Amino acid sequence: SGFRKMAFPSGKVEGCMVQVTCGTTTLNGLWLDDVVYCPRHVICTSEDMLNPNYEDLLIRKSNHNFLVQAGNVQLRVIGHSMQNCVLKLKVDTANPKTPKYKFVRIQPGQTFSVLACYNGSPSGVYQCAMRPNFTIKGSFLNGSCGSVGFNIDYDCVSFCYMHHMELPTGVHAGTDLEGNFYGPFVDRQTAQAAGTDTTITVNVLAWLYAAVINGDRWFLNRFTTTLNDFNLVAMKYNYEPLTQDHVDILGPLSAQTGIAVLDMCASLKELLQNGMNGRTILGSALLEDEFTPFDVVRQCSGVT
Amino acid sequence: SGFRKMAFPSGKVEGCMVQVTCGTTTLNGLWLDDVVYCPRHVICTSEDMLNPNYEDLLIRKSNHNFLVQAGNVQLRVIGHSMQNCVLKLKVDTANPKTPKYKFVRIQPGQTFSVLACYNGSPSGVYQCAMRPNFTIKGSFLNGSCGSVGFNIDYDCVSFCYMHHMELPTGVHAGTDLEGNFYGPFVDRQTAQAAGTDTTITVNVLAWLYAAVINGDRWFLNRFTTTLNDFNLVAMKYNYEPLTQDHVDILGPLSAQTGIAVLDMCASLKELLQNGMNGRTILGSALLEDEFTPFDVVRQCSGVT
Numbered sequence: 167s168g169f170r171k172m173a174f175p176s177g178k179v180e181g182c183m184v185q186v187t188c189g190t191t192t193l194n195g196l197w198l199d200d201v202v203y204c205p206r207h208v209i210c211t212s213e214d215m216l217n218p219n220y221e222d223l224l225i226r227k228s229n230h231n232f233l234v235q236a237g238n239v240q241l242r243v244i245g246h247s248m249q250n251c252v253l254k255l256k257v258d259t260a261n262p263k264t265p266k267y268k269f270v271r272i273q274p275g276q277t278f279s280v281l282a283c284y285n286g287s288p289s290g291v292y293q294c295a296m297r298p299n300f301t302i303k304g305s306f307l308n309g310s311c312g313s314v315g316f317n318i319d320y321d322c323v324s325f326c327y328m329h330h331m332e333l334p335t336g337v338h339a340g341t342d343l344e345g346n347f348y349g350p351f352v353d354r355q356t357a358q359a360a361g362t363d364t365t366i367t368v369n370v371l372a373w374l375y376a377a378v379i380n381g382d383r384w385f386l387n388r389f390t391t392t393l394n395d396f397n398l399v400a401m402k403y404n405y406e407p408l409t410q411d412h413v414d415i416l417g418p419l420s421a422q423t424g425i426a427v428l429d430m431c432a433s434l435k436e437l438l439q440n441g442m443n444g445r446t447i448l449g450s451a452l453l454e455d456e457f458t459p460f461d462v463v464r465q466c467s468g469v470t
Numbered sequence: 471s472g473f474r475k476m477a478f479p480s481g482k483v484e485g486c487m488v489q490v491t492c493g494t495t496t497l498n499g500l501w502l503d504d505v506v507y508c509p510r511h512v513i514c515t516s517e518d519m520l521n522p523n524y525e526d527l528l529i530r531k532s533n534h535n536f537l538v539q540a541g542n543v544q545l546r547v548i549g550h551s552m553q554n555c556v557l558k559l560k561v562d563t564a565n566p567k568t569p570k571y572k573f574v575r576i577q578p579g580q581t582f583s584v585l586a587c588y589n590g591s592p593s594g595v596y597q598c599a600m601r602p603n604f605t606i607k608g609s610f611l612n613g614s615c616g617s618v619g620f621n622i623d624y625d626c627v628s629f630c631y632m633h634h635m636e637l638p639t640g641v642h643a644g645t646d647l648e649g650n651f652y653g654p655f656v657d658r659q660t661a662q663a664a665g666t667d668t669t670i671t672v673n674v675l676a677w678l679y680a681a682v683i684n685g686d687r688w689f690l691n692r693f694t695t696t697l698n699d700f701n702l703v704a705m706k707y708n709y710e711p712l713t714q715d716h717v718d719i720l721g722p723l724s725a726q727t728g729i730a731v732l733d734m735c736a737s738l739k740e741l742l743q744n745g746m747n748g749r750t751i752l753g754s755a756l757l758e759d760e761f762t763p764f765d766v767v768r769q770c771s772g773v774t
């Protein structure tokens with residue numbers, strides 16, 4: 167009973183967080199095996215951030231200039247390299263708490279947990295989604311850079327995000343663990359505006375299935391629709407187009423509830439056109455889109 | 471930038487979760503020092519749950535009937551006792567991962583993180599609040615009993631909740647770590663209806679301060695009110711009465727933003743009377759009440 171915005175247990179990732187300092191800038195690093203990954207903007211001063219030339223700035227940096235501390239103990243840096251927008255600091259000690267891990271690059275609409283850190287110390291964990299405009303709506307202050315996003319499949323942590331910046335509008339941008347930004351963003355203090363933050367339709371549908379499974383059924387109507395008809399309405403409301411791949415992904419939820427995917431689309435179409443009328447669904451007055459179909463199945467089945 | 475429903479990092483609590491089985495019932499236990507705490511209903515069969523006599527049922531149980539497994543290894547039970555609605559199983563091994571801890575009994579309106587577990591294995595973490603009717607709106611399935619709620623102050627985990635049951639309406643009830651239920655609930659499969667789930671006014675105000683700090687200011691109006699005038703409106707909307715103690719607790723948020731607490735009350739009064747008009751505050755279409763003033767300060771300051 168009940169449906170909550172749930173993050174993965176963060177323990178495995180807490181065991182990887184370290185503090186990285188270069189000059190007067192301190193941010194977070196991810197320590198996996200004998201490598202510490204961190205945003206390359208750790209080498210910048212506030213005056214460098216306006217138009218940094220990372221290759222040039224890195225020439226003035228040596229291994230001993232990167233101070234890495236895990237807990238209250240210092241790690242010895244024996245190498246450093248830049249891969250895209252991340253620095254990889256080779257240390258002389260493999261992280262004894264390194265979990266089984268992968269680096270994955272997620273697609274928009276995919277959700278993940280963020281372990282927000284400051285000074286290499288965890289402050290909290292929350293669930294995010296990669297928006298269709300490649301931003302994330304996180305909760306990050308100065309010092310949170312290097313905090314990571316991840317998913318866990320039993321005992322393997324798939325790291326998908328590393329926090330790099332906040333845009334002037336308060337939304338967030340970062341990279342995968344190979345240092346490639348999600349979206350068109352760059353690690354520079356410049357005019358970077360996000361595109362349209364459309365709603366992740368397949369995720370809203372998954373959450374409507376979660377509401378039916380949990381007893382919230384008032385929005386179920388007597389209508390059906392087609393993908394093309396639904397998509398005409400979805401476009402109008404700034405919702406992402408629904409594809410047959412999304413319908414296939416919702417199949418297990420459709421099977422468990424006996425509600426055909428296109429019927430749920432028609433209910434969603436009426437919610438968009440009529441509004442909620444002061445009513446709530448799973449304690450929310452808006453259509454939640456940061457639960458994937460996989461998250462709904464996992465939460466409704468108790469996957470550990 | 472940004473404000474998220476954030477849970478505490480769960481690592482310290484993950485190191486305490488064990489599986490407890492008695493007969494055909496398997497639930498979760500909390501292993502701190504050489505004691506495993508778990509709901510006493512682990513001794514019940516589905517036929518016992520209708521009108522259980524826990525003292526009588528416990529007579530038929532011996533130490534060897536409680537199977538405790540931490541990871542894939544079995545713990546030896548050398549004693550057992552019932553304290554209120556929890557069982558304390560003494561084991562021969564102190565939990566090597568026992569963090570610094572306290573057992574606290576929270577008041578309604580207080581928030582906490584829940585590490586939802588099944589078979590002693592963590593599945594997810596989310597943030598909850600003890601409702602004014604002493605229920606919690608969690609996400610718990612069969613097997614989640616024994617999952618705990620907690621707060622962390624630097625390195626000391628204060629355990630405040632242990633999950634025991636779901637009411638027929640899908641809301642949740644549990645105890646503190648001394649086995650005393652929050653509210654009038656009992657660990658019996660019987661007619662237990664919750665009282666009015668009023669809104670935690672002081673928490674809504676704290677979240678409105680968080681919205682102002684994060685740029686969402688559209689709801690700020692040109693009015694002020696008094697505690698008595700505000701409370702007349704609060705009663706009408708099923709909001710908890712606001713006291714001078716709550717005003718004092720909001721003082722740091724009032725100071726940081728320069729918005730007098732009573733002025734924020736007047737903004738909240740207008741939001742109640744006029745509604746949101748299709749607008750959102752911190753990405754929500756309803757007034758969020760599961761952030762305490764302390765949570766707002768902690769998140770807005772980056773406490774680790």
Ligand SMILES: CS(=O)(=O)NCC[C@@H]1CCCCN1CC(=O)Nc1cccnc1
Nearest residue numbers: 207306307308331332333334353354355
């Ligand atoms: C906001 S801006 O005028 O576009 N300049 C961004 C500043 C630089 C641009 C280059 C990379 C470092 N940031 C710092 C940064 O974004 N820190 C931060 C703070 C809060 C939340 N998240 C991260």
Ligand SMILES: CS(=O)(=O)NCC[C@@H]1CCCCN1CC(=O)Nc1cccnc1
Nearest residue numbers: 511610611612635636637638657658659
């Ligand atoms: C729902 S009732 O008809 O009031 N009976 C409650 C059953 C017994 C009553 C006595 C204690 C054990 N529960 C089982 C229980 O609530 N399990 C569960 C399941 C999902 C979420 N959370 C917990």
